[PDB]
């Protein structure tokens, strides 16, 4: 489709930032929510559930954790929180607060301890969800942030937008339709505006071992402003959670006991 083709062309012409702004602008012509509701999707033995927040990339969703759920079999059951609006018909959230509310609702209405997990921008959604859960009285035992680049610490990702955008078209596992592409615009604006709050929750940073592009020093790595443990897995920003899902599972096991 036209949006998908424009996204591709945005990547090769160095104009992703302004195309993301166009997608955000379009997304303001879909309907939004701020009594809407959603449901987790079950993906096994274990005492503490690993709950996964879908990413916010155009190809994102529950399916992107299939390989880590499999690698976590025998360690923890795995449930997945979808990001509302990536499926046709779903409204978009008016804010980070609006999506954490309905997501927090669905976790509390179906749990029994748990940790919350997310990849890339998914990590930021996961930490917002855990923030909202700790505020409501049902706090997870911790958060696992997989290649998180919080706002203000994304110089590497911005300098690699062409590499990442072409890599997303290689690994297009669900096809980026219009509903997905505008949702990408709308969530990208929300997470850009959002700022994590200190919570005191135990935090595990799972960083990639390999950069997605050239860089002069180590400062390309994920970062987190509050106290946390850090572990590295083989792979780049994309492969760390797919072809190397087992390396992450083992670190999650160790961190859980």
């Amino acid at each position, epitope marked *: 489709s036209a949006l998908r083709d424009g996204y591709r062309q945005a990547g090769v012409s*160095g104009r992703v930032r302004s195309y993301l702004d166009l997608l955000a602008g379009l997304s303001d012509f879909r309907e939004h929510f701020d009594g809407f509701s959603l449901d987790l999707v079950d993906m096994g033995p274990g005492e503490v559930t690993v709950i996964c927040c879908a990413g916010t990339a155009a190809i994102s969703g529950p399916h992107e954790f299939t390989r880590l759920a499999g690698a976590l079999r025998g360690i923890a059951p795995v449930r997945a929180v979808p990001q509302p609006g990536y499926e046709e018909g779903e409204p978009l959230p008016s804010s980070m607060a609006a999506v954490a509310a309905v997501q927090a609702d669905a976790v509390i209405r179906t749990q029994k301890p748990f940790v919350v997990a997310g990849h890339s921008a998914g990590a930021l959604m996961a930490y917002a969800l855990a923030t909202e859960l700790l505020d409501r009285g049902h706090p997870p035992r911790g958060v696992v942030l997989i290649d998180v680049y919080p706002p203000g610490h994304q110089d590497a990702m*911005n*300098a690699w937008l*062409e590499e990442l955008t072409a890599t997303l078209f290689d690994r297009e596992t669900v096809r980026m339709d219009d509903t997905r592409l505008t949702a990408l615009g709308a969530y990208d604006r929300l997470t850009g505006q959002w700022r994590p709050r200190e919570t005191g929750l135990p935090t595990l940073l799972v960083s990639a071992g390999e950069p997605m592009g050239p860089w*002069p020093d180590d400062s390309w790595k994920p970062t987190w402003p509050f106290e946390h443990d850090t572990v590295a897995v083989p792979g780049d920003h994309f492969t760390m959670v797919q072809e190397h899902a087992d390396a992450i599972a083992r670190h999650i096991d160790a961190w859980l006991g």
Partner: antibody
Amino acid sequence: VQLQQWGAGLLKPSETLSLTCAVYGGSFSGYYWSWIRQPPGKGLEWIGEINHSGSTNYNPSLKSRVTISVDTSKNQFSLKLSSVTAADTAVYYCARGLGYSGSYYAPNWGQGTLVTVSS
Amino acid sequence: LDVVMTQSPLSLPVTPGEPASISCRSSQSLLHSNGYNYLDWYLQKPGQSPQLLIYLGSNRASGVPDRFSGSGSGTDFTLKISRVEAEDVGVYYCMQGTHWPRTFGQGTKVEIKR
């Protein structure tokens, strides 16, 4: 979309070179911004670069004397080079994102200010 | 230690409408884990600032006519013009972007044999 360059063209040895580049047409926040120099008759030497947050990459041969600054408020970035000698005589250019991806629509380099060092 | 870029030939006279090729060889590989090569080509026409022609080894900047094209990977790279025209007189530089500092080849001057 366009870069304008100004600054003093003659300075005595041991003094401090000072140049400024202004970026017209936005897109300031997505790229590192470079300074390059070209002594008369010779090739190109990369000096260093800065982004909007003020993060800085320098050429080790010049790191001791070079300072690159940014003023996001005016979309301007500046070059200062201290304790200057005759080997710093050159044409100095400003540019966007040298060597990074994303450069299909790269702006033209600044037109370059010649800087001569002499008493 | 800095990449050293060697350009060949340093001087290249071509009769117009003939093709021409410039080679450059780096002292370390410009190939990156992710597959891309970070090699740029610039043209400095007489009296002007360098301008980008080829970026990421093989991609043409906007406004660059299709007679220009680049090729190569890892340690050697070439720039080729198919039908050399009068407008193409100037000095061609390659520059590597995989390492810091960025470093340039010596430059090769193209003269039109008229």
